[PDB]
Amino acid sequence: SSSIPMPAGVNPADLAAELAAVVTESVDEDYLLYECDGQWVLAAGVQAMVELDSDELRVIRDGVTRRQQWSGRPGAALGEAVDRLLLETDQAFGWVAFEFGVHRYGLQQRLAPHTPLARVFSPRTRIMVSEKEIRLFDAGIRHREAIDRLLATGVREVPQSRSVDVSDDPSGFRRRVAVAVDEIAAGRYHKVILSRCVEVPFAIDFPLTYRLGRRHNTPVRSFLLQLGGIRALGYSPELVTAVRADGVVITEPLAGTLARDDLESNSKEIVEHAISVRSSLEEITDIAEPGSAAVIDFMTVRQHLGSTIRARLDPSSDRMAALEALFPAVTASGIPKAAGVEAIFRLDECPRGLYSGAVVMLSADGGLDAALTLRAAYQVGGRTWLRAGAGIIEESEPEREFEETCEKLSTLTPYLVARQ
Ligand SMILES: CC/C=C(\Oc1cccc(C(=O)O)c1O)C(=O)O
């Protein structure tokens, strides 16, 4: 592993996104860029790919596709395949669909054939960009030369963004909210997050849009990818799960959005956060060593209220079982989870795919970092879209919930750089 000192006056997010744009374009390869605690890890090129679908698990390496049938928990099937990738490389990267978390609640039968659950790959090369340095892992002569070419040219200036209209309601979000409210009033469930897609009528430049949005967002994690026909970027507002090599499991649920003093005193925000903390604690307990489950920094301010649920991974459990136990996040699903998830199948455009799922980074040492996929842009086929939702409770009003989606979309809407 060779290192290059980081040039002065260069933001690591800008350089990592530029390396993903220029280097990957020149060699015409798939990639995933993941931002995790000041490190921007560019996973470049697909050495091997694990595709977990509702009805099949495939492992693709050098054009050879191996197909397997699988039963039981999807986390066990994904874990087994991902552990094999990690015998060859130090790290693996990918995304996990919202649909991966439905099996736990007895909803596997509702999934159509070929429904994607997860896409995890081992990269050919890794470029780690931080404020201090640029670290190269398994970088061939072509990659080294292309990186050197980038450092010499410097970073491109970000063009002005192109606006998008979010005022239409073609999916009938308002009507769908009204149905959810009626179901809550009838005591079917307490909460459900419903969403709407917003079509972007022009092609966007993903690395340039990523750079622009990143200068106006402070996320828990962020990502930029081009993998298997999918382009995506996002500013993850929540950590679903983080598993360390030592076995420490962390989950950080968030709630609500000087005074400041209002958020800490709001009864409606305190109850929802406490219910979620209790839910996360009950789930982490199923995979944790007895008595290791604890809430650190309960209901502390982070423009939002949040808590850190910590535990120690039981020897009879694993990282995927920890991910599966916490999936999907309460933030993007519902309370109770089982009824909330089922309501999403009926009242939301399904399959959700990447939206409200997770973007993951795994390590050979047993590490796992899973960021909740929200505040993300997607491009699949000739379709470019944004997706945002809102938590629906008994008191919820359809027109108010629609305005809330507009606010959540405003994290991306002013920062869309058109493809030139
Ligand atoms: C930190 C997370 C808290 C919230 O974020 C969200 C929750 C649910 C859905 C979304 C979305 O973009 O669809 C979202 O951004 C909030 O807005 O209250």
PDB file of N, CA, C and O and ligand atoms in Angstrom, residues 191 193-196 220 235-238 253-257 269 304-305 330-333 355-356 372-376 387-391 404-405 408-409 411, ligand 1:
ATOM      1  N   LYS A 191     -47.260   4.148  13.907  1.00  0.00           N
ATOM      2  CA  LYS A 191     -46.546   4.982  12.932  1.00  0.00           C
ATOM      3  C   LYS A 191     -46.167   4.209  11.669  1.00  0.00           C
ATOM      4  O   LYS A 191     -45.953   2.999  11.718  1.00  0.00           O
ATOM      5  N   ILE A 193     -43.868   5.302   7.755  1.00  0.00           N
ATOM      6  CA  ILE A 193     -43.213   6.276   6.895  1.00  0.00           C
ATOM      7  C   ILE A 193     -43.625   5.944   5.478  1.00  0.00           C
ATOM      8  O   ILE A 193     -43.352   4.838   5.003  1.00  0.00           O
ATOM      9  N   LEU A 194     -44.344   6.876   4.830  1.00  0.00           N
ATOM     10  CA  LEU A 194     -44.745   6.756   3.443  1.00  0.00           C
ATOM     11  C   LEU A 194     -43.928   7.749   2.654  1.00  0.00           C
ATOM     12  O   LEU A 194     -43.515   8.767   3.205  1.00  0.00           O
ATOM     13  N   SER A 195     -43.673   7.449   1.390  1.00  0.00           N
ATOM     14  CA  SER A 195     -42.839   8.269   0.534  1.00  0.00           C
ATOM     15  C   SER A 195     -43.417   8.500  -0.851  1.00  0.00           C
ATOM     16  O   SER A 195     -44.444   7.928  -1.211  1.00  0.00           O
ATOM     17  N   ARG A 196     -42.728   9.342  -1.634  1.00  0.00           N
ATOM     18  CA  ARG A 196     -43.069   9.613  -3.021  1.00  0.00           C
ATOM     19  C   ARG A 196     -41.804   9.785  -3.824  1.00  0.00           C
ATOM     20  O   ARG A 196     -40.821  10.339  -3.336  1.00  0.00           O
ATOM     21  N   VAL A 220     -24.230  11.691   8.469  1.00  0.00           N
ATOM     22  CA  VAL A 220     -23.582  10.699   9.334  1.00  0.00           C
ATOM     23  C   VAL A 220     -22.573   9.933   8.444  1.00  0.00           C
ATOM     24  O   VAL A 220     -21.454   9.637   8.859  1.00  0.00           O
ATOM     25  N   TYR A 235     -26.743  11.369   1.214  1.00  0.00           N
ATOM     26  CA  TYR A 235     -26.242  11.963   2.452  1.00  0.00           C
ATOM     27  C   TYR A 235     -27.021  11.321   3.577  1.00  0.00           C
ATOM     28  O   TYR A 235     -28.103  11.799   3.942  1.00  0.00           O
ATOM     29  N   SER A 236     -26.528  10.149   4.021  1.00  0.00           N
ATOM     30  CA  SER A 236     -27.163   9.294   5.010  1.00  0.00           C
ATOM     31  C   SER A 236     -27.346  10.029   6.338  1.00  0.00           C
ATOM     32  O   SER A 236     -26.356  10.465   6.953  1.00  0.00           O
ATOM     33  N   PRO A 237     -28.615  10.208   6.784  1.00  0.00           N
ATOM     34  CA  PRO A 237     -28.839  10.927   8.050  1.00  0.00           C
ATOM     35  C   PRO A 237     -28.731  10.051   9.292  1.00  0.00           C
ATOM     36  O   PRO A 237     -28.870  10.579  10.375  1.00  0.00           O
ATOM     37  N   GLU A 238     -28.508   8.727   9.144  1.00  0.00           N
ATOM     38  CA  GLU A 238     -28.493   7.815  10.284  1.00  0.00           C
ATOM     39  C   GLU A 238     -27.658   6.573  10.050  1.00  0.00           C
ATOM     40  O   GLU A 238     -27.656   5.998   8.956  1.00  0.00           O
ATOM     41  N   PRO A 253     -30.304   5.604  16.517  1.00  0.00           N
ATOM     42  CA  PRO A 253     -31.575   6.162  16.021  1.00  0.00           C
ATOM     43  C   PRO A 253     -31.733   7.647  16.331  1.00  0.00           C
ATOM     44  O   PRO A 253     -31.328   8.107  17.395  1.00  0.00           O
ATOM     45  N   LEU A 254     -32.260   8.400  15.359  1.00  0.00           N
ATOM     46  CA  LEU A 254     -32.468   9.844  15.448  1.00  0.00           C
ATOM     47  C   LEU A 254     -33.936  10.186  15.338  1.00  0.00           C
ATOM     48  O   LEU A 254     -34.670   9.495  14.628  1.00  0.00           O
ATOM     49  N   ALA A 255     -34.353  11.289  16.013  1.00  0.00           N
ATOM     50  CA  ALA A 255     -35.728  11.815  16.005  1.00  0.00           C
ATOM     51  C   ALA A 255     -35.802  13.360  16.078  1.00  0.00           C
ATOM     52  O   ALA A 255     -34.963  14.000  16.716  1.00  0.00           O
ATOM     53  N   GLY A 256     -36.808  13.923  15.404  1.00  0.00           N
ATOM     54  CA  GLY A 256     -37.113  15.352  15.370  1.00  0.00           C
ATOM     55  C   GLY A 256     -36.146  16.257  14.635  1.00  0.00           C
ATOM     56  O   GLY A 256     -34.945  15.972  14.555  1.00  0.00           O
ATOM     57  N   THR A 257     -36.672  17.381  14.103  1.00  0.00           N
ATOM     58  CA  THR A 257     -35.885  18.397  13.394  1.00  0.00           C
ATOM     59  C   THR A 257     -36.433  19.791  13.712  1.00  0.00           C
ATOM     60  O   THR A 257     -35.711  20.624  14.255  1.00  0.00           O
ATOM     61  N   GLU A 269     -42.140  14.476  20.224  1.00  0.00           N
ATOM     62  CA  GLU A 269     -40.818  14.051  19.744  1.00  0.00           C
ATOM     63  C   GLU A 269     -40.089  13.147  20.739  1.00  0.00           C
ATOM     64  O   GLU A 269     -39.330  12.266  20.328  1.00  0.00           O
ATOM     65  N   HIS A 304     -31.036  17.718  15.617  1.00  0.00           N
ATOM     66  CA  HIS A 304     -31.896  16.551  15.928  1.00  0.00           C
ATOM     67  C   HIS A 304     -31.596  15.858  17.286  1.00  0.00           C
ATOM     68  O   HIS A 304     -30.483  15.965  17.813  1.00  0.00           O
ATOM     69  N   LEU A 305     -32.602  15.138  17.836  1.00  0.00           N
ATOM     70  CA  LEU A 305     -32.460  14.330  19.055  1.00  0.00           C
ATOM     71  C   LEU A 305     -31.962  12.962  18.615  1.00  0.00           C
ATOM     72  O   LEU A 305     -32.480  12.403  17.642  1.00  0.00           O
ATOM     73  N   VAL A 330     -36.394   1.980  12.142  1.00  0.00           N
ATOM     74  CA  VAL A 330     -37.702   2.499  12.571  1.00  0.00           C
ATOM     75  C   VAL A 330     -37.966   3.839  11.851  1.00  0.00           C
ATOM     76  O   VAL A 330     -39.091   4.090  11.404  1.00  0.00           O
ATOM     77  N   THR A 331     -36.913   4.659  11.711  1.00  0.00           N
ATOM     78  CA  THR A 331     -36.889   5.956  11.024  1.00  0.00           C
ATOM     79  C   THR A 331     -37.564   5.941   9.660  1.00  0.00           C
ATOM     80  O   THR A 331     -38.158   6.938   9.286  1.00  0.00           O
ATOM     81  N   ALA A 332     -37.426   4.856   8.934  1.00  0.00           N
ATOM     82  CA  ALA A 332     -37.991   4.764   7.608  1.00  0.00           C
ATOM     83  C   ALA A 332     -39.006   3.660   7.409  1.00  0.00           C
ATOM     84  O   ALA A 332     -39.407   3.427   6.320  1.00  0.00           O
ATOM     85  N   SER A 333     -39.403   3.009   8.480  1.00  0.00           N
ATOM     86  CA  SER A 333     -40.391   1.974   8.431  1.00  0.00           C
ATOM     87  C   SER A 333     -41.704   2.202   9.175  1.00  0.00           C
ATOM     88  O   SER A 333     -42.624   2.646   8.599  1.00  0.00           O
ATOM     89  N   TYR A 355     -33.802   2.919  -1.534  1.00  0.00           N
ATOM     90  CA  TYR A 355     -34.481   3.842  -0.617  1.00  0.00           C
ATOM     91  C   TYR A 355     -34.912   3.174   0.681  1.00  0.00           C
ATOM     92  O   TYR A 355     -35.643   2.186   0.649  1.00  0.00           O
ATOM     93  N   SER A 356     -34.468   3.754   1.834  1.00  0.00           N
ATOM     94  CA  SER A 356     -34.733   3.313   3.209  1.00  0.00           C
ATOM     95  C   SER A 356     -34.039   1.971   3.524  1.00  0.00           C
ATOM     96  O   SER A 356     -34.299   1.369   4.566  1.00  0.00           O
ATOM     97  N   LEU A 372     -28.081   4.375   6.721  1.00  0.00           N
ATOM     98  CA  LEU A 372     -29.470   4.405   6.249  1.00  0.00           C
ATOM     99  C   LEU A 372     -29.595   5.246   4.983  1.00  0.00           C
ATOM    100  O   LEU A 372     -29.210   6.423   4.981  1.00  0.00           O
ATOM    101  N   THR A 373     -30.145   4.639   3.910  1.00  0.00           N
ATOM    102  CA  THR A 373     -30.291   5.316   2.623  1.00  0.00           C
ATOM    103  C   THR A 373     -31.527   6.196   2.552  1.00  0.00           C
ATOM    104  O   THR A 373     -32.623   5.721   2.293  1.00  0.00           O
ATOM    105  N   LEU A 374     -31.319   7.490   2.783  1.00  0.00           N
ATOM    106  CA  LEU A 374     -32.313   8.558   2.696  1.00  0.00           C
ATOM    107  C   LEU A 374     -31.521   9.737   2.171  1.00  0.00           C
ATOM    108  O   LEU A 374     -30.286   9.735   2.279  1.00  0.00           O
ATOM    109  N   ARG A 375     -32.211  10.726   1.579  1.00  0.00           N
ATOM    110  CA  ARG A 375     -31.600  11.944   1.008  1.00  0.00           C
ATOM    111  C   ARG A 375     -30.627  11.524  -0.094  1.00  0.00           C
ATOM    112  O   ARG A 375     -29.463  11.914  -0.117  1.00  0.00           O
ATOM    113  N   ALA A 376     -31.140  10.657  -0.987  1.00  0.00           N
ATOM    114  CA  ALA A 376     -30.412  10.036  -2.078  1.00  0.00           C
ATOM    115  C   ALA A 376     -31.073  10.256  -3.428  1.00  0.00           C
ATOM    116  O   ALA A 376     -32.286  10.475  -3.508  1.00  0.00           O
ATOM    117  N   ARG A 387     -36.310  10.512  -3.936  1.00  0.00           N
ATOM    118  CA  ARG A 387     -37.347   9.884  -3.129  1.00  0.00           C
ATOM    119  C   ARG A 387     -37.297  10.369  -1.689  1.00  0.00           C
ATOM    120  O   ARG A 387     -36.248  10.320  -1.058  1.00  0.00           O
ATOM    121  N   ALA A 388     -38.431  10.860  -1.175  1.00  0.00           N
ATOM    122  CA  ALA A 388     -38.508  11.340   0.196  1.00  0.00           C
ATOM    123  C   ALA A 388     -39.845  10.965   0.803  1.00  0.00           C
ATOM    124  O   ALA A 388     -40.855  10.889   0.109  1.00  0.00           O
ATOM    125  N   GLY A 389     -39.833  10.761   2.099  1.00  0.00           N
ATOM    126  CA  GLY A 389     -41.013  10.382   2.841  1.00  0.00           C
ATOM    127  C   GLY A 389     -41.215  11.227   4.067  1.00  0.00           C
ATOM    128  O   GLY A 389     -40.563  12.260   4.238  1.00  0.00           O
ATOM    129  N   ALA A 390     -42.131  10.782   4.924  1.00  0.00           N
ATOM    130  CA  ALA A 390     -42.484  11.435   6.185  1.00  0.00           C
ATOM    131  C   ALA A 390     -43.182  10.453   7.112  1.00  0.00           C
ATOM    132  O   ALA A 390     -43.949   9.608   6.649  1.00  0.00           O
ATOM    133  N   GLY A 391     -42.915  10.577   8.407  1.00  0.00           N
ATOM    134  CA  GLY A 391     -43.542   9.771   9.453  1.00  0.00           C
ATOM    135  C   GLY A 391     -44.999  10.168   9.617  1.00  0.00           C
ATOM    136  O   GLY A 391     -45.310  11.357   9.774  1.00  0.00           O
ATOM    137  N   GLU A 404     -43.639  18.528   4.052  1.00  0.00           N
ATOM    138  CA  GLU A 404     -42.507  17.893   4.729  1.00  0.00           C
ATOM    139  C   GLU A 404     -41.637  17.120   3.717  1.00  0.00           C
ATOM    140  O   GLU A 404     -40.418  17.186   3.806  1.00  0.00           O
ATOM    141  N   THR A 405     -42.262  16.458   2.710  1.00  0.00           N
ATOM    142  CA  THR A 405     -41.489  15.722   1.707  1.00  0.00           C
ATOM    143  C   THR A 405     -40.674  16.701   0.874  1.00  0.00           C
ATOM    144  O   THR A 405     -39.489  16.460   0.626  1.00  0.00           O
ATOM    145  N   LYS A 408     -37.616  17.677   2.908  1.00  0.00           N
ATOM    146  CA  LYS A 408     -36.675  16.550   2.870  1.00  0.00           C
ATOM    147  C   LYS A 408     -35.995  16.450   1.514  1.00  0.00           C
ATOM    148  O   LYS A 408     -34.805  16.202   1.479  1.00  0.00           O
ATOM    149  N   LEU A 409     -36.718  16.734   0.413  1.00  0.00           N
ATOM    150  CA  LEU A 409     -36.191  16.766  -0.959  1.00  0.00           C
ATOM    151  C   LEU A 409     -35.213  17.936  -1.172  1.00  0.00           C
ATOM    152  O   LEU A 409     -34.259  17.782  -1.934  1.00  0.00           O
ATOM    153  N   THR A 411     -32.828  18.891   0.396  1.00  0.00           N
ATOM    154  CA  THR A 411     -31.480  18.439   0.725  1.00  0.00           C
ATOM    155  C   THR A 411     -30.722  18.160  -0.600  1.00  0.00           C
ATOM    156  O   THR A 411     -29.490  18.224  -0.641  1.00  0.00           O
TER     157      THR A 411
HETATM  158  C1  LIG B   1     -32.538  11.790  10.716  1.00  0.00           C
HETATM  159  C2  LIG B   1     -33.728  11.216  10.010  1.00  0.00           C
HETATM  160  C3  LIG B   1     -34.892  11.899  10.334  1.00  0.00           C
HETATM  161  C4  LIG B   1     -35.693  12.256   9.365  1.00  0.00           C
HETATM  162  O1  LIG B   1     -35.202  11.951   8.200  1.00  0.00           O
HETATM  163  C5  LIG B   1     -35.992  11.227   7.488  1.00  0.00           C
HETATM  164  C6  LIG B   1     -36.846  10.333   8.069  1.00  0.00           C
HETATM  165  C7  LIG B   1     -37.643   9.582   7.232  1.00  0.00           C
HETATM  166  C8  LIG B   1     -37.554   9.752   5.866  1.00  0.00           C
HETATM  167  C9  LIG B   1     -36.677  10.643   5.295  1.00  0.00           C
HETATM  168  C10 LIG B   1     -36.595  10.847   3.789  1.00  0.00           C
HETATM  169  O2  LIG B   1     -35.778  11.620   3.307  1.00  0.00           O
HETATM  170  O3  LIG B   1     -37.406  10.264   3.128  1.00  0.00           O
HETATM  171  C11 LIG B   1     -35.907  11.389   6.136  1.00  0.00           C
HETATM  172  O4  LIG B   1     -35.044  12.270   5.670  1.00  0.00           O
HETATM  173  C12 LIG B   1     -36.664  13.431   9.475  1.00  0.00           C
HETATM  174  O5  LIG B   1     -36.795  14.158   8.502  1.00  0.00           O
HETATM  175  O6  LIG B   1     -37.275  13.593  10.511  1.00  0.00           O
END
